[PDB]
Design an enzyme around this catalytic site. Structure first.
Site, short mmCIF file in Angstrom:
data_model
loop_
_atom_site.label_atom_id
_atom_site.label_comp_id
_atom_site.label_asym_id
_atom_site.label_seq_id
_atom_site.Cartn_x
_atom_site.Cartn_y
_atom_site.Cartn_z
N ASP A 138 -0.64 -49.15 20.06
CA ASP A 138 -1.35 -50.37 20.26
C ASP A 138 -0.31 -51.41 20.49
O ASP A 138 -0.15 -52.49 19.82
CB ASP A 138 -2.10 -50.76 19.09
CG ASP A 138 -3.11 -49.71 18.57
OD1 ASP A 138 -3.68 -49.26 19.45
OD2 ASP A 138 -3.30 -49.27 17.42
N1 LIG Z 1 -3.10 -42.17 14.60
C1 LIG Z 1 -3.91 -43.20 14.41
C2 LIG Z 1 -5.26 -43.20 14.88
C3 LIG Z 1 -6.06 -44.37 14.62
N2 LIG Z 1 -5.64 -45.60 13.90
C4 LIG Z 1 -6.88 -46.68 13.57
O1 LIG Z 1 -7.85 -47.34 14.37
C5 LIG Z 1 -8.78 -47.98 13.51
C6 LIG Z 1 -8.99 -49.43 13.93
O2 LIG Z 1 -7.84 -49.91 14.60
P1 LIG Z 1 -6.99 -51.17 14.06
O3 LIG Z 1 -7.92 -52.23 13.43
O4 LIG Z 1 -6.22 -51.76 15.18
O5 LIG Z 1 -5.98 -50.56 12.97
P2 LIG Z 1 -4.69 -51.39 12.49
O6 LIG Z 1 -3.79 -51.62 13.65
O7 LIG Z 1 -3.95 -50.65 11.35
O8 LIG Z 1 -5.28 -52.79 11.98
P3 LIG Z 1 -4.32 -53.94 11.38
O9 LIG Z 1 -2.87 -53.70 11.84
O10 LIG Z 1 -4.80 -55.32 11.86
O11 LIG Z 1 -4.39 -53.87 9.90
C7 LIG Z 1 -8.28 -47.85 12.06
O12 LIG Z 1 -9.27 -47.25 11.25
C8 LIG Z 1 -7.01 -47.00 12.10
O13 LIG Z 1 -7.13 -45.83 11.32
C9 LIG Z 1 -4.10 -45.40 13.47
O14 LIG Z 1 -3.41 -46.25 12.84
N3 LIG Z 1 -3.37 -44.28 13.73
MN LIG Z 2 -3.63 -50.56 15.37
#
Ligand SMILES: Nc1ccn(C2O[C@H](COP(=O)(O)OP(=O)(O)OP(=O)(O)O)[C@@H](O)[C@H]2O)c(=O)n1
Ligand SMILES: [Mn+2]
Ligand SMILES: [Mn+2]
Ligand SMILES: [Zn+2]
Ligand SMILES: [Zn+2]
EC number: 2.7.7.6
Lengths: 83, 263, 64, 133, 188, 146, 36, 114, 764, 145
Positions: F116
């Protein structure tokens, strides 16, 4: 209360922890311009120097292992096997 | 004239479509790139704001200024400011432009880039002029004012390359393709039901003979022809994007030679 | 706020087409996409530039 | 310095399963009731059809860089169409009282059942393979 | 201040996935379409299947038509808008119809083995970026070392570190001490 | 004879309606009225977007110049979305948008967009994509109860 | 009480103005203090 | 900020050179030059031509991180043949074929109306 | 204090153990370095550069303890360093520092890295340390910490360093592996059909930093020199690595290109995907760590990435709306699949509505009905999805991701493409919140699919209004359940770590608390470190009685049951030998008893259990190492084997006390490894299977023994914390039947709750 | 249920068995009912296990509950960490849950002896804790050439 060099019962091998302490104790001293005992075959970096020291077995320290009941065994650098 | 071959198929003030023929992908691609990034050109790169009563912030407008394409056909005769022995800028390393505008009318008054006055000595090298291509000869809209609203500015242009900031770059998009049938198999086609139903024929296919369904794949072929089309923003005419492109390459590579020599 | 001077993505000047784009629609009655193709903005990147500008200045200039 | 097995095959079968450029020929010996070929081939660089048939030799040369053709403009320890280079990984499937030796060509695999060339087939990699049509 | 996008700033579509910019490339270096269109932005496919954000992918397909045709693209929910129809129209507009395009490697000119899903998509800059966020507190005259960070370091065995980082600068004072009554009673 | 691509709906097994909805898309609120095709999204995601849109930058009012607030972020160049909803109209999102229509590729190309993250076009930036103004106001009072 | 959120408290807060729709959204919020 | 100024992508830091050339330890007749304030445009072109040369046993380049404009090109050559010699030889053709092309172009354009 | 915090980003060009630090953050942080004639020159240049040009320095301190501030200091440009002065120098490439992502729930969330100084403003990391820090690049920030003395530097690099944490004790496998892009692509690279040409090839080779310079030889010479993807990856995989693996019908000719086999650091067969290169029990990163050591392994990830991302940069990979469309025929089969399940529920319905449905035993009627329609509807969902999955092609990019391991699962395909499914709130169908109905667009008493929450459609097709709302009901339930999870989870974690924090291993091998008490008389019942332990199969346990006697019985005195003489030189000469027979009969008796014992310890029959010392791997290696011909008898004799293996037993030491008590412990601690042992180095195996020589054999064994001793736990380890973090951390990734499960259970455990939620007897 | 059990020829086979499972718990009494196997009855209430079959049996039921939690999510933790935990909870013989000045006064009148092996103790005092790299001392080796 001291345990004679024979009869010692703990590992003859050096542990990670002992080795980490050793090399760093020594590098603290080589970083304070203490004399060294090995050939500098180029090295400037005190850890590194110390780790050549520990491989050529010229680090004269002793590790004192306490056992949980107050008793201890003294093992020399020289002696401890480094794996 | 033996070697890499050309073949214009259209040309226009603004575009030049052509076909390179008998050349490696790399040189093709490299020409591409140079056109996009490294051909010198002229652009506002300093602006001093005496007055701005506009509805836009100073940096905002300054930015827009660096983006108005300025005449650049004599730009080899302009030194880079950083090579010139002047203190700062002067007539061998810069044009200076002026902008003044007051919202005189009740209705709104537009500021366009023809409202750009040069102020400095050109020595009769054709540079610096705002470039104009709309019917009305406005060129680009820079600003707008209401009645009572003022803006005064100077700008300094300088020669520059788009690596450094894209303002300085001459070319706009540059088509580029090769092997329009797919014959090298350089790409593998995604599809649902059938690979030809579903992907569009490139126009560049007519110029080239369909393959024939027996014909077993040709392991020896190479990439020898390319279909391009250079588009000019106007600071420099077009044929000139290409020749100056060719030419900047060729200097690139010679700086390498000179510096084997100095080893 | 104001037409942008070039396509973000290609460099094509696009700052000199807003007047006209809007005269093409209101004066000669073209639908937004035949208009844009009249101005020569035939890749989608420049189309989007004209097609989605919003002339906010117009509302800024109403303040005194 | 040698060659080491060499015979003519009958091709029973050409499966491409799932791939495009690659296919697995199930061939026989014309001669021997016993000696079989299963093998992978680049079909695009060397197409091959059901019942076609084949001249097949493993060989052992003509471990240093590789260098393009030039040596290759006269020096061809090939008068074939098709030549791979692989590695034997064998399993001496030593099965019944016939052999099978395994070979991989960058992963395009081979396997020869038989018996007369036990005291023949390299224990070992350096093993080329050659085909003409 | 004017804030020019950078490495670190955040962005997002409207489908509930963000990203930070990891690196910028100038145009030459991007992959390009035969028409010489290049991306403003390249997002990874791994972000997709597990989020199950098919809205993204249809928004991009309907957006591509809309730019090519000059009409507003109706993405409301609960209508008869369909991929099928969107793709239809795009094909009439001479593109393959699921939004793929062949693209070329910029470094080399060569074509790319697989084709790319390519189209406009409305992305938002969000507030809150690596200049607000970067600090670095090492004196002269989060961001800590809590119980949970201690406990990791006890898990590694790092006692020297755990003492230096938890000490006082509060100087080692010295003191004599009785060896029967451990107190600081000793007249020295 | 139904359109194999349309969604299945299960009919009026009803002769007694007393009413009809005006539009189903009115079940949403202000934020989720800005997501396109939220009927094609997993539910939680419409929920995160409904938050992050609250952090995007656009033009909050046409009056910014003249206010003076603690903080404010106006993007140089708002564009209206190529994909909109009918609800937008009423939310004026086309008029005071918060976004721009970026040409996006979905691709592995170098590995600097992993996990991401994104690669952005520096030339595009050069020419303004995503730039924005930021304002901070500071205050102070004078003397007091001395 | 307008200044504080002193009532039930967070009853009044500062209007968000990040973006036009964040504003509309704020004006449209609701809050439940304190079995599903 | 911590952004390096853009000019650094095309223009030389105090102390740096256009080339540095270094002998390869790995194999014989081999060098690695590292080119500064250059990128793929040059790197892939010189590279590609060193490989139309039949005394060219290896050639390859890379930019090891995209933050820096520098590339590293490794030529290995037949015994007798300086690699440096091979790079003149190939720089030389390049300049030649372009030479050409600017000429086939400058011509094809006059043959022209609009 | 001496730390910083920024936004992190990924970077395919940094090594595993690096950390990019922006220069401005490098100019703020400092390390005090002591002037010595080894550095007094560099230190001096650094001083002359000053605070504001990096490599530089912010203070110099002398003898006196006087602090010389280089930014102000009228003499900042005129300092003549003395020996024993100190210089607080900016940090710089290669200094160790500790990097941490909060919340730090196990110790590999705080690892030591090598500084690399870089431009712009985020800390940058290799994609493969991601997973242990549970960090990604949409925002996350991380802290970095700079150690202040030499000791402290040495702790950090000799125990906390990245490379040392590859293999973790939490689950006795790697905690880092190949991900995301390089995964997607390492598979595509390694397919059958992937060939590369020489231009590309050599560019891939050069890309591996320590390629010896040798162009390897192409697997196709003939029409064309064309190398396979296999072989070029293989450049990165170092010499002396052997791995094999059989997937569900893999053979040594793997039709499908399944499994994997790799010998002397070259791939022979199989596509490389998450099983091989991911953070998997027995895969390449676990092998190479062990065979060659942490530093090589940590180079490997960065060679592999080098290579493959090169390749992927030129090949390309995307996904699009297309990849979710399934075939018109498939969707008609999906639509019927679904239609059929709605009829089955309709008959169940009518059936209940005529009162002809039966409950079975204590379960209500209605419960019975629900349990049935929800089976039906989910069995639909599923069949509809398998339908889609099958229909989509190899080139289906979603499929290519699932295939590789890198991202996506079935349920994903399923919901996107075929049908999203029954929604539910607390374990049941959407409930009647209005009276007798789920929404006012239905009539009352409606228990059908659509009324209580089945979503028929896929996301491609989109949902209906009703559907829409019940999926959000569902959705919501997760979003709450996930905050409650995360908070319940963090509190347990901190109480287990305070509970256990003081337990340590002592130089008696005993595990104890801060009063001395004993908790365990040797750590883990075996005295191992759980990093060093791997899943092996214990052979004696399985199998028919016939087949165990084929495989292990040697009967010298029988001409059917001896060792063939082609096995062994001495083989003529031992037939009929009575006194070798008496040893061999004692070997057997032992194998027999071993089989009884184990079957009492694992009553089930499971064979595969974690133990230290991967003996298969060692034998594999001695087989490669000594060029072993399967085609000549061995020079081993009976006794070399049979006593040779007995003797090795005595030196597998965990405990070392002279008295009887410790000796029995010693023997009990080594029991289970010992049985594996004997099974693996039984006579007939050593000869007929392995074929070892004498030399190879004796290599086997002195290998087994160093490997054994290096697995033993080290005194001083804080196993307490460990324990607690290993149990904790995973308890945080429980974000997700009719017994109380998951976190509240585990709350009910650790609480010792008199009043449990589901209490149950199971009675046989 | 299926139950892997060796067959007469030795290799493991499935052999189904019926099993009962209950809501509610009376182990001491159900244990006693004719016809069941009392050697193999279980319950997820470890407390009751402890109270009918004792500390050791309790400790093994507890492990088995903690491992069930951890494996039902589908993850894997090596034995010895949860074996640690459970030993901790059962070493006083019962099942013990894991979940300023005032205090020092108590210490005082109780004659508390603080062993000084912890980290914070040792920080107060300016020292390294006898953990890890602190769990031995190092001394100068006068015994060497
Ligand atoms: N290998 C993977 C597959 C999926 N995700 C995820 O995608 C979902 C929603 O995405 P997001 O909100 O972007 O997760 P984060 O980036 O961890 O959010 P934040 O950094 O704002 O806490 C979450 O349940 C999280 O498990 C992850 O970190 N790793
Ligand atoms: Mn993420
Ligand atoms: Mn994140
Ligand atoms: Zn000048
Ligand atoms: Zn454009």
């Amino acid at each position: 209360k001291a345990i004679p060099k024979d009869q010692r019962a703990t590992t003859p091998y050096m542990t990670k922890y002992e080795r980490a302490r050793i090399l760093g104790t020594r590098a603290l001293q080589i970083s304070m311009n203490a004399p060294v005992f090995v050939d500098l075959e180029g090295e400037t970096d005190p850890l590194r120097i110390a780790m050549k020291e520990l491989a050529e077995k010229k680090i004269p320290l002793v590790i004192r292992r306490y056992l949980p009941d107050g008793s201890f065994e003294d093992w020399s650098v020289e002696e401890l096997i480094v794996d | 004239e033996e070697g890499p071959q050309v073949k214009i198929r259209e040309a226009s003030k603004d575009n030049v479509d052509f076909i390179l023929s008998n050349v490696d992908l790399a040189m093709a691609n490299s020409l591409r790139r140079v056109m996009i990034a490294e051909i010198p050109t002229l652009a506002i790169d300093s602006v001093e704001v005496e007055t701005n009563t506009t509805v836009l912030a100073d940096e905002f407008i300054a930015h827009r200024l660096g983006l108005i394409p300025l005449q650049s056909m004599d730009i080899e005769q302009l030194e880079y400011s950083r090579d010139c022995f002047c203190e700062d800028h002067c007539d061998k390393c810069s044009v200076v432009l002026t902008l003044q505008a007051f919202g005189e009318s009740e209705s709104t008054t537009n500021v366009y880039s023809k409202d750009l006055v040069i102020v400095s000595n050109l020595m009769g090298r054709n540079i610096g002029h705002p470039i104009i291509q709309d019917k009305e000869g406005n060129g680009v809209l820079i600003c707008k004012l209401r009645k009572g609203q003022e803006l005064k500015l100077t700008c300094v242009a300088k020669k520059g390359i788009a690596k450094e900031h894209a303002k300085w770059g001459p070319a706009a998009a540059i088509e580029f393709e090769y092997d329009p049938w797919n014959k090298l198999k350089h790409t593998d086609y995604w599809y649902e039901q059938d690979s030809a139903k579903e992907w569009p024929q490139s126009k560049n296919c007519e110029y080239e003979d369909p393959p024939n369904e027996g014909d077993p794949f040709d392991y020896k072929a190479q990439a020898d022809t390319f279909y391009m089309n250079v588009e000019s923003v106007g600071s420099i005419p077009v044929d000139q994007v290409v020749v100056r492109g060719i030419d900047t390459l060729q200097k690139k590579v010679a700086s390498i030679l000179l510096a084997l020599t100095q080893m | 706020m104001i037409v942008p001077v070039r396509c973000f993505s290609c460099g094509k000047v696009v700052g000199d087409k807003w007047e006209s784009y809007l005269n093409l629609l209101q004066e000669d009655e073209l639908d937004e996409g035949t208009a844009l193709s009249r101005l020569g903005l035939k890749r989608y990147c420049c189309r989007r530039m004209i097609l989605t500008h919003v002339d906010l200045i117009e509302k800024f200039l109403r303040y005194n | 310095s040698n060659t080491l097995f060499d015979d003519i095959f009958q091709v029973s079968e050409v499966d491409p399963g799932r791939y495009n450029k690659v296919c697995r020929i199930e061939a026989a010996s014309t001669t021997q009731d016993q000696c079989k070929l299963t093998l992978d081939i680049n079909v695009e660089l060397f197409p091959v059809a059901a019942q076609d048939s084949l001249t097949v030799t493993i060989a052992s040369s003509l471990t240093r860089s590789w260098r393009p053709p030039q040596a290759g403009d006269r020096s061809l320890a090939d008068d074939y169409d098709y030549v791979m280079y692989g590695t034997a990984y064998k399993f001496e499937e030593v099965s019944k009282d016939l052999i099978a030796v395994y070979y991989s060509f960058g992963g395009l695999l081979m396997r020869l059942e038989g018996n007369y060339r036990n005291l023949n087939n390299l224990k070992q990699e350096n093993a080329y393979l050659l085909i003409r049509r | 201040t004017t804030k020019i996008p950078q490495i670190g700033d955040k962005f997002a579509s409207r489908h509930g996935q963000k990203g930070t910019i990891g690196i910028t490339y100038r145009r030459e270096d991007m992959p390009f379409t035969a028409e010489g269109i290049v991306p403003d932005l390249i997002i990874n496919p791994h972000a997709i299947p597990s989020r199950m954000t098919v809205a993204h992918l249809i928004e991009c397909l309907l957006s591509k038509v809309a730019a090519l045709s000059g009409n507003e693209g109706d993405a409301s929910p609960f209508t008869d808008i369909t991929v099928e129809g969107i793709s239809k129209l795009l094909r009439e507009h001479g593109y393959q119809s699921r939004g793929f395009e062949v693209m070329y490697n910029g470094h080399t000119g060569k074509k790319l083995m697989a084709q790319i899903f390519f189209g406009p998509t409305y992305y938002q800059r969000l507030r809150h970026m690596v200049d607000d966020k970067i600090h670095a507190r090492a004196r002269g005259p989060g961001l800590r070392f809590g119980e949970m960070e201690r406990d990791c370091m006890i898990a590694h065995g790092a006692a020297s570190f755990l003492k230096e980082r938890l000490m006082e600068a509060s100087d080692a004072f010295r003191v004599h001490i009785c060896g029967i009554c451990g107190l600081m009673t000793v007249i020295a | 004879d139904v359109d194999p691509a349309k969604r299945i709906r299960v009919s009026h097994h009803a002769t007694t309606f007393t009413h009809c909805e005006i539009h189903p898309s009115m079940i949403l609120g202000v934020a989720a009225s800005i997501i396109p095709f939220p009927d094609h999204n997993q539910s939680p995601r419409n929920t995160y977007q409904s938050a992050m849109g609250k952090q995007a930058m656009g033009v909050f009012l046409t009056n910014y110049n003249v206010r003076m607030d603690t903080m404010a972020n106006i993007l140089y160049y708002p564009q209206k979305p190529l994909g909109t909803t009918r609800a937008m109209e009423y939310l004026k999102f086309r008029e005071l948008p918060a976004g721009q229509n970026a040409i996006v590729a979905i691709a592995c190309y170098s590995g600097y967009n992993q996990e991401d993250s994104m690669i952005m076009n520096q030339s595009s930036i050069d020419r303004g994509l995503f730039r924005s103004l930021f304002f901070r106001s500071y205050m102070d009072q004078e003397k007091k109860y001395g | 009480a307008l200044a504080t959120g002193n009532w039930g408290a967070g009853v009044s807060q500062v209007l968000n103005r990040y973006t036009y729709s964040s504003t509309l959204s704020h004006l449209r919020r609701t809050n439940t203090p304190i079995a599903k | 900020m911590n952004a390096p100024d853009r000019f650094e992508l095309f223009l030389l830091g105090e102390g740096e050179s256009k080339l540095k050339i270094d002998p390869d330890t790995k194999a014989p007749n081999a060098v690695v030059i590292t080119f500064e304030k250059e990128d793929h445009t040059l790197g892939n072109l010189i590279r590609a031509e060193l490989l139309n040369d039949r005394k060219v046993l290896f050639a390859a380049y890379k930019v090891e991180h995209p933050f820096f404009a520098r590339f590293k090109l490794r030529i290995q050559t037949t015994e007798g043949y300086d690699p440096k010699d091979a790079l003149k030889n190939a720089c030389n053709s390049i300049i030649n074929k372009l030479g050409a092309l600017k000429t086939n172009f400058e011509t094809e354009w006059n043959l022209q109306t609009l | 204090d001496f730390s910083a915090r920024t936004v992190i980003s990924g970077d395919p060009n940094l090594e595993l153990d690096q950390v990019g630090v922006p220069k401005s953050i490098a100019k703020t942080l400092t390390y005090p370095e002591v002037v010595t004639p080894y550095n007094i020159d560099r230190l001096t240049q650094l001083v002359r550069n000053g605070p504001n040009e990096h490599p530089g320095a912010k203070y110099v301190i002398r003898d006196s303890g006087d602090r010389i501030d280089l930014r102000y200091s009228k003499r900042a440009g005129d300092i003549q360093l003395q020996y024993g002065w100190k210089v607080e120098r900016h940090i710089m490439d290669n200094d160790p520092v500790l990097f941490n992502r909060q919340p730090s729930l196990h110790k590999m969330s705080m690892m030591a890295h090598r500084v690399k100084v870089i431009p712009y403003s985020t800390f940058r990391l290799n994609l493969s340390v991601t997973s242990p820090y549970n960090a990604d690049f949409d925002g996350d920030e991380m802290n970095l910490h700079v150690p202040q003395s030499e000791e402290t530097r040495a702790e950090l690099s000799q125990l906390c360093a990245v490379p040392l944490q590859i293999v973790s004790p939490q689950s006795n496998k790697p905690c880092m592996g190949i991900v995301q892009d390089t995964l997607c692509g390492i598979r595509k690279l390694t397919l059958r059909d992937t060939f590369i040409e020489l231009d590309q090839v050599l560019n891939m080779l050069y890309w591996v930093p320590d390629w010896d310079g040798v162009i390897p030889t192409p697997a196709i010479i003939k029409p064309k020199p064309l190398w396979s993807g296999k072989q070029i990856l293989s450049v990165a995989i170092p010499n002396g690595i052997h791995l094999q693996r059989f997937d569900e019908g893999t053979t040594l000719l793997s039709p499908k290109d399944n499994g994997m086999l790799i010998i002397d650091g070259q791939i022979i067969f199989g596509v490389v995907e998450k099983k091989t290169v991911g953070s998997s029990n027995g895969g390449l990163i676990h092998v190479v760590t062990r065979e060659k050591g942490p530093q090589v392994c940590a180079k490997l990830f960065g060679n592999i990435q080098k290579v493959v991302n090169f390749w992927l940069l030129h090949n390309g990979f995307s996904t699009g709306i297309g990849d979710t469309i399934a075939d018109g025929p498939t969707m008609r089969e999906i639509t019927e699949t679904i239609a059929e399940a709605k009829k089955k529920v309709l008959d169940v319905t009518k059936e209940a509505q005529a009162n002809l449905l039966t409950a079975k035993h204590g379960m209500t009627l209605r419960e019975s009905f629900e349990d049935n329609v929800v089976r039906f509807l989910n069995e639909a969902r599923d069949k509809a999805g398998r339908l889609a999955e099958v229909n989509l092609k190899d080139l289906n990019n979603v499929k290519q991701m699932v295939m590789a391991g890198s991202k996506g699962s079935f349920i994903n395909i399923a919901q996107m493409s075929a049908c999203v499914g029954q929604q539910s709130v607390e374990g049941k169908r959407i409930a009647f919140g209005f009276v007798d109905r789920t929404l006012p667009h239905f009539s009352k008493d409606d228990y059908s699919p659509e009324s209580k929450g089945f979503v028929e459609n896929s996301y491609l097709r989109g949902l209906t209004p009703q559907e829409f709302f019940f999926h959000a009901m569902g959705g919501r339930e997760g979003l709450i359940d996930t905050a409650v999870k995360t908070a319940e989870t963090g509190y347990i974690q901190r109480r287990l770590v305070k509970a256990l924090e003081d337990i340590m291993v002592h130089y008696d091998n005993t595990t104890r608390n801060s009063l001395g008490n004993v908790i365990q008389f040797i750590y883990g019942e075996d005295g191992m470190d759980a990093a060093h332990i791997e899943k092996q199969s214990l052979d004696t346990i399985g199998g028919s009685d016939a087949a165990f006697e084929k495989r292990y019985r040697v009967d010298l005195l029988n001409t059917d049951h001896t060792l063939d003489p082609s096995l062994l030189e001495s083989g003529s000469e031992i037939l009929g030998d009575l006194k070798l027979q008496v040893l061999l009969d004692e070997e057997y008796k032992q194998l027999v008893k071993d089989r009884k014992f184990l079957r009492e310890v694992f009553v089930d029959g499971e064979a595969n259990w974690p133990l230290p010392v991967n003996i298969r791997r060692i034998i594999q290696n001695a087989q490669q190492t000594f060029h072993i011909d399967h085609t000549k008898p061995s020079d081993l004799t009976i006794k070399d084997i049979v006593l040779g293996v007995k003797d090795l037993q005595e030196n597998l030491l965990v405990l070392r006390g002279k008295n009887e008590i410790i000796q029995n412990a010693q023997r009990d601690a080594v029991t289970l490894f010992c049985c594996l042992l004997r099974s693996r180095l039984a006579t007939r195996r050593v000869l007929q299977e392995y074929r070892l020589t004498k030399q190879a054999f004796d290599w086997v064994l002195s290998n087994i023994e160093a490997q054994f001793l290096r697995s033993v736990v080290h005194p001083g380890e804080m196993v307490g914390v460990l324990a607690a973090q290993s149990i904790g951390e995973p308890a945080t990734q429980m974000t997700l039947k009719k017994v109380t499960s998951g976190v509240p259970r585990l709350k009910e455990i650790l609480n010792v709750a008199k009043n449990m939620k589901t209490p149950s007897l199971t009675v046989y | 249920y299926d139950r892997k059990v060796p067959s007469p020829t030795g290799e493991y086979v499935k052999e189904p068995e019926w099993v009962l499972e209950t809501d509610g718990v009376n182990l001491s009494e159900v244990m006693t009912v004719p016809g069941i196997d009392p050697t193999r009855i279980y319950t997820n209430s470890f407390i009751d296990i402890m109270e009918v079959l004792g500390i050791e049996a309790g400790r093994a039921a507890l492990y088995k509950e903690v491992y069930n939690v951890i494996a039902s999510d589908g993850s894997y933790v090596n034995y010895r960490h949860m074996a640690l935990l459970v030993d901790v909870m059962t070493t006083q013989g019962g099942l013990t849950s894991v979940t300023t000045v005032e205090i020092l006064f108590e210490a005082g009148a109780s004659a508390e002896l603080d062993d000084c092996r912890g980290v914070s103790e040792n920080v107060i005092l300016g020292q390294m804790a006898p953990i890890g790299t602190g769990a031995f001392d190092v001394m100068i080796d006068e015994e060497s050439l």
